[PDB]
Amino acid sequence: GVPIQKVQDDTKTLIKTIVTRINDISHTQSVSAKQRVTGLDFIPGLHPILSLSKMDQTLAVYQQVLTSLPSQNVLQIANDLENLRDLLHLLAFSKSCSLPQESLDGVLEASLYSTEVVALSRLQGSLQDILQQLDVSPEC
Amino acid sequence: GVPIQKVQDDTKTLIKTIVTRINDISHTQSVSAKQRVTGLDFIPGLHPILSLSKMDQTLAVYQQVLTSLPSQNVLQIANDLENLRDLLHLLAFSKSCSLPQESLDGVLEASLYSTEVVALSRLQGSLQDILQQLDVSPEC
Amino acid sequence: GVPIQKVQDDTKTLIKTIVTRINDISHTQSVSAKQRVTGLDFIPGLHPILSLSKMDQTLAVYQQVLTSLPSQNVLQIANDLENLRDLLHLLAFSKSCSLPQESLDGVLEASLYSTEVVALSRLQGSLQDILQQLDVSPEC
Amino acid sequence: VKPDPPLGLHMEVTDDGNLKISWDSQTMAPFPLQYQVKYLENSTIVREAAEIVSATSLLVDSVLPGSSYEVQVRSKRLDGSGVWSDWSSPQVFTTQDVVYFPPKILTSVGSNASFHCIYKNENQIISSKQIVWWRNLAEKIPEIQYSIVSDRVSKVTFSNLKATRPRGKFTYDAVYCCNEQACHHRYAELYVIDVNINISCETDGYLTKMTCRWSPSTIQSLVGSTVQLRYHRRSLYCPDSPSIHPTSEPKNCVLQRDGFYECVFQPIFLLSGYTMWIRINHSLGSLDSPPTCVLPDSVVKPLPPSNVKAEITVNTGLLKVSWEKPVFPENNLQFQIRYGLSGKEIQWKTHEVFDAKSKSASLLVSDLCAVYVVQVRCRRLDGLGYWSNWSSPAYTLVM
Amino acid sequence: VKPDPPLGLHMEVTDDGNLKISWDSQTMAPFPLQYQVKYLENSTIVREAAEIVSATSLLVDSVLPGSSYEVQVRSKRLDGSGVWSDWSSPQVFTTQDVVYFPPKILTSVGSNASFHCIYKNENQIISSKQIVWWRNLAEKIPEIQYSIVSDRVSKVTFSNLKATRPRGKFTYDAVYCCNEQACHHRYAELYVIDVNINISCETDGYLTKMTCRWSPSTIQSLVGSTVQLRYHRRSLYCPDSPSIHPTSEPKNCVLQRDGFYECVFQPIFLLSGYTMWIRINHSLGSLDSPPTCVLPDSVVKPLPPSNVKAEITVNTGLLKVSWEKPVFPENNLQFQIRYGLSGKEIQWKTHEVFDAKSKSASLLVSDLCAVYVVQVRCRRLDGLGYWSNWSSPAYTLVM
Amino acid sequence: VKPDPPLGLHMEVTDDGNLKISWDSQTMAPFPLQYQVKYLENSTIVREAAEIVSATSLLVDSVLPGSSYEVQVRSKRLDGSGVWSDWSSPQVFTTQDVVYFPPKILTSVGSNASFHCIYKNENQIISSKQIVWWRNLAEKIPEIQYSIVSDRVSKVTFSNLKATRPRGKFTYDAVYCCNEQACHHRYAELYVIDVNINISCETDGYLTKMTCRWSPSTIQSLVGSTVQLRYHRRSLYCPDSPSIHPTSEPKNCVLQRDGFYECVFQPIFLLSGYTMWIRINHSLGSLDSPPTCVLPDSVVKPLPPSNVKAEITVNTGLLKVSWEKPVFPENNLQFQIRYGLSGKEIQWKTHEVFDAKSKSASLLVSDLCAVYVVQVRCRRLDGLGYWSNWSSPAYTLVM
Ligand code: NI
Ligand code: NI
Ligand code: NI
DSSP, X not given: OOOHHHHHHXXXXXXXXXXXHHHTOHHHHTSOTTOOEETOXXXXXXXXXXOHHHHHHHHHHHHHHHHHSXXXXXXXXXXXXXXXXXXXXXXXXXXXXXXXXXXXXXXXHHOHHXXXXXXXXXXXXXXXXXXXXXXXXXXX | OOOHHHHHHHHHHHHHHHHHHHHXXXXXXTSOSSOOEETOTTSOXXXXXXXXXXXXXXXXXXXXXXXXXXXXXXXXXXXXXXXXXXXXHHHHHHHOOOOOOOOHHHHHHHXXXXXXXXXXXXXXXXXXXXXXXXXXXXXX | XXXXXXXXXXXXXXXXXXXXXXXHOHHHHTSXXXXXXXXXXXXXXXXXXXXXXXXXXXXXXXXXXXXXXXOHHHHHHHHHHHHHHHHHHHHHHHHXXXXXXXXXXXXXXXXXXXXXXXXXXXXXXXXXXXHHTSXXXXXX | OOOOOOEEEEEEEXXXXXXXXXXXXXXXXXXXXXXXXXXXXXXXXXXXXXXXXXXXXXXXXXXXXXXXXXXXXXXXXXXXXXXXXXXXXXXXXXXXXXXXXXXXXXXXXXXXXXXXXEEBSSSOBXXXXXXXXXXXXXXXXXXXXXXXXXXXXXXXXXXXXXXXXXXXXXXXXXXXXXXXXXXXSOOEEXXXXXXXXXXEEEEOTTSSXXXXXXXXXXXXXXXXXXXXXXXXXXXXXXXXXXXXXXXXXXXXXXXXXXXXXXXXXXXXXXXXXXXEEEEEXXXXXXXXXXXXXXXXXXXXXXXXXXXXXXXXXXXXXXXEEEEEOOSSOOSOEEEEEEEEESSSSOOOEEEEEOOTTOOEEEEEOSOTTSOEEEEEEEEETTOOSOOOOOOOOEEOOOO | OOOOOOEEEEEEEOTTSOEEEEEEOOTTOSSOEEEEEEEEEESSSEEEEXXXXXXXXXXXXXXXXXXXEEEEEEEEESSSSOOOOOOOOOEEEEOOSEEEESXXXXXXXXXXEEEEEEEBSSSOBOOTTTXXXXXXXXXXXXXXXXXXXXXXXEEEEEOSOOOOXXXXXXXXXXXXXXXXXXXXXXXXXXXXXXXXXXXXXXXXXXXXXXXXXXXXXXXXXXXXSXXXXXXXXXXXXXXXXXXXXXXXXXXXXXXOTXXXXXXXXXXXXXXXXXXXXXXXXXXXXXXXXXXXXXXXXXGBOOOOOEEEEEEEOTTTOEEEEEEEOOSSXXXXXXXXXXXXXXXXXXXXXXXXEOOTTOOEEEEEOSOTTSOEEEEEEEEETTOOSOOOOOOOOEEXXXX | OOOOOOEEEEEEEOTTSOEEEEEEOOTTOSSOEEEEEEEEEESSSEEEEEEEESSSEEEESSOOTXXXXXXXXXXXXXXXXXXXXXXXXXXXXXXOSEEEESSEEEEETTOOEEXXXXXXXXXXXXXXXXXXXXETTTEEOOGXXXXXXXXXXXXXXXXXXXXXXXXXXXXXXXEXXXXXXXXXXXXXXXXXXXXXXXXXXXXXXXXXXXXEEEOOTTTTTOOSSEEEEEEEEESSBOOSSOOOOSSOEEEOOEEOTTSOEEEEEOSOOTTBEEEEEEEEEETTEEEEOOOEEEOGGGGBOXXXXXXXXXXXXXXTOEEEEEEEOOSSOOSOEEEEEEEEESSSSOOOEEEEEOOTTOOEEEEEOSOTTSOEEEEEEEEETTOOSOOOOOOOOEEOOOO
């Protein structure tokens, strides 16, 4: 009933869409994604992203962070993350496996620019890695 | 001073004018004027209207009914009836003779459509009769 | 620093300006300035204005009168008169000399047209006299 | 009962120059009241008077210039053992050095108007043979127009008044009454307005409403006062000479983008006479335009003739034009047909049909093989009305 | 506890023709109440009844025409030794001479609808074989549509209903049920509306919002009732057959001058199924249009191709047109180029490019020395979407 | 007297980085109070201090990053055997990991600005030889701009500042001070705004009011802060170099449809110097544009020449143009006449008249029998002002 190849292609197209949107955020493109910045250690930066449950909780944390950032673009980005997470949840149903489901506010008030730029460049790195490994048979 | 033949011609022209107006009310033309409808028995339908006092009280009752219908058309026909009553008063003055001068709400509220269609087709019939007898020497 | 000949020319230009303004007030040009009119005896009309301190207190009174007329033109004339007073103060400073600084409401209310035309034509006459004597060695 | 003192004690100067003292009657008293007014005129002579009146007003003869009136009033029941109220609070009214009779006159172009004046000079009323009248401090009025009402009252009479030319914001002539060469500041205000405004009405083709238009080009200059239309409807027809009926009602008229006001009467009474005029509500009074009476039946604009057809009659070559008379009016109508060659520019020729029963005409045409364009309009045969609009164009077929 | 008597005793006629008696529950009672209703139906036969109910309402079967209902209620605590309240004040409810079952029906075009009626004629139920149905007092309904439910209940059945044509302010058909020749003034209201409204949605070029447009030309006639758009979002994609989900939410949309309503969803869920329909909340009930499901990804309007250039190749004279594909969509696109001689009137010729990897095309041109104007637009190769707007005009250089 | 404890205890960081403790003086005390402040700095070292001050505030030197200050104050009557109040409620102030000196700088284009910072890394103030400065986390600031104030305080100095380019809603540059490779999220906000706004004023042709226009295109980006025009009027004339007077007043300006602000001065003082500027009242302070002084007498735009006539002189064939100089100014003026053949396109020729007493000029014309169009404009002979508008066209009569 559900054609898995169309869904996989839609996942790649949606990934390319989120990546181009974040590439359009000019201030983030000139910021080193892999550079670690103190205070935002809760943000899931470059750290082998190798399993379905960690990806789900990663996109969940990134979503929770974006909900608090007051930009309309970030709101749209959060909606794209909702559709993408549900697509990975349906893919996990396709492969058969269960998936279960603090200081960020302080930095949002004290350093909104930093919180945004870092969250976005680390998000950009996470999506490039997930994309580069969504074809080498992802497993639960 | 007052030309009685002129006033008589204005009376005929006003009657034909009101008849054409009521003829423009499409839903009433297809309704049998002489057909009896229970509830509107107080409305003075077809019964030889051969005298000035009965003609006057008939147009007065029809006016009293029309004053309560919230249609603009009904307002103009009632205003034309005011001009018509003044012409009948002037003709009675011309021939020399004196002319003296409740349940409507319930039927108006419960059945406005019926009150309107009946009042108008019965009024049209009364006016058609008056026209056919405004030349056989009308008497007070 | 302050060119005294320039200041004399600016004084002449401002006086001629006020006289031309009053000349543009059509209703005042046809009124005899020297004609006595009962009620405005408090108005400093034609009376040898022969000293800098007397000119200053006269123009001060004229300013106080103009402040009460609800006309925009009279307001502008009072502002120009303020600049004129400052120019006469600078001229007295140039020549070295110190310069210090009721029934009007009733006549303003009962007869505005006459009070206005008179106040203005007497002002125009006073300025024409001061102009005619601002070259015969004016003295403090 | 002890009634209260009368309230609202006011004092005005009448057009005759008398002091009218007025007060509010107690609207709650179920019985007639008599009043006693005590007043003290502090002039060059102090005079105290106390008068008993049954009216709610007193007239005091001849306001003295430069005098002060102090006034109190008390009430008593007229019928019976009435106790007097206490006195009102004293009210003070201060008169002025010149007095005008009347102080202002509001009239229209072409009328005759006359002013009276009293000049007090150091507490002394001068002789009328000394009083001189002046206009806007500009020109002396010819002595021919002066009139000696009495040894102390002067009069100026203007005839065939011409419209006042506005000087700046001043739309009135300031008329001064002077003691020989020396004038005083107090003047009289004279307003002459061109009240000859034309109101035109037109009833719609459906006989359901009447739109009346009028231009306030005369009055788009006087501010402070209001201008509105009043009307009165007579049960049947228009009088031979219209008049201003004492009982009237105002009609709300709306100003249009073209600067005209438009007021629509709906519903209408077709055989009822509508008399309308413009009433000018000035602070000093009211002005009325010449009244006009319009009968809606005589201002009807009919709809154009319908179902207009034009065919070239086979073999005969006549332009047979046919039409259907409009639903209204029922009166016998006359028709006018315009016809021309179909082109970029149509040279219209017209033919007039004066018999109401003609639903068709036959016309001679020069080119049997051209398309003719034809339109028709209608009017009441008796001329009592307007011409209809031209019908929608009808085209011949080339055969 | 002795509770108080129930308050607010009201009586309504249900759509089925039953008498619904209701009362306010005591919001202060911390325990369930049982009620006893006593009612007296004064018809041609007096009937007294006393019923015990745990609900705050009672249904009495089949309101009798020309009867009077007198009602009292008392309360008691349901659980325990409850004392009864005193009885409520008696409330009177007066029924009417004709009864309709139901009194009104609101349906859509093409449906089947049937009315039942009861006719009381001088306190006598006539035979059902006598009732005849009429429409708007204009025409007798064919007896084929009549059905004898019982000896006293008549039924009229309409099939394949056509939209009711509005006569003046009347937007419903008055269906009358008459006793042979004599009809009554009371009628039933039948409203048949064309609910087949089409809603069209378009997602902006940045895929950040979706604007949906719809025309209420069907419903710009019914006043009193409200019309609003309702929607429900499904996590992913559209079902094979859309349905009205029981759980939905309204979206506030604003009417534009073009007469269409425009409602924007922002932010959007690109891969979530948006099911929308128009809800007509009338006093008589609610009506829902046939639901439609739209996937925003499939209604995307891409931005036009950018950096469009046109150059004449030296010596060869070919028109080289080049462009840059829009940022979105990522799917393979097809392009359409229009080109023409630069003039007051551009004779556009079009060329279609169906290979996604083509960033340029080469065109044969007739005049190597004229300025050509060229524009390009794009569309999804699979056709699942709209055409983009035309690019900004590109001009050739004269070489 | 035993006074009450001080109230309103607040703690702020000064732009210099000191902790200012403040409290409300008891407005009801008819005698001077002395205070004793007790504070506990919980840093890496606990410090307890108790100071006696006669002022209602205390400055504590150099706020330590990552420390907590707890503060209590008590009061006593200054003169005599005063009993001490009880201690205030303890107030807690929590410092942050990095401290900037000052935390924000608002400056204009072309200025020099420098920030100082202290970085605590695991409860240790690091050495100045490792701190490196960055701009918006994008690029390392050249070490040339760094300055070692001391072994623990770093300084960054920017010279000839360029306007900050806004990135999205961010209108400031985030300047970061980092411990070698590792930066922290806390940054300093640097706002560089182009305060070089030009205000242009123009006096009306009637010399009754002066209108000043300015564009807020610079400031239609900063929200939260307010922008208003301030001015100060000097009795006579403008200074050689305008300055920001300490005493000024605000002027209510209205934004126009073109996006410009208009400030209307009415009435005006022709010979009074009006010094005006734009004030940007931001949460962090106030900014003033370079002040300008305008003398309305020097910005007058005269009315065009009036009564312009053009006649062809009989027998001689000269175009005699004549005019009346505008009412103002009375000072000697120069005139410019344009004349041309009356057509759809007028080939204007111009003649300049430099003598103020010339009310007419005579021009050579090629065709004596054509209608010529003529217009005249004027300007102050000394050039101190603008040119008037062209007069209303004058046409010759063909004679
Ligand atoms: Ni009468
Ligand atoms: Ni579901
Ligand atoms: Ni100074």
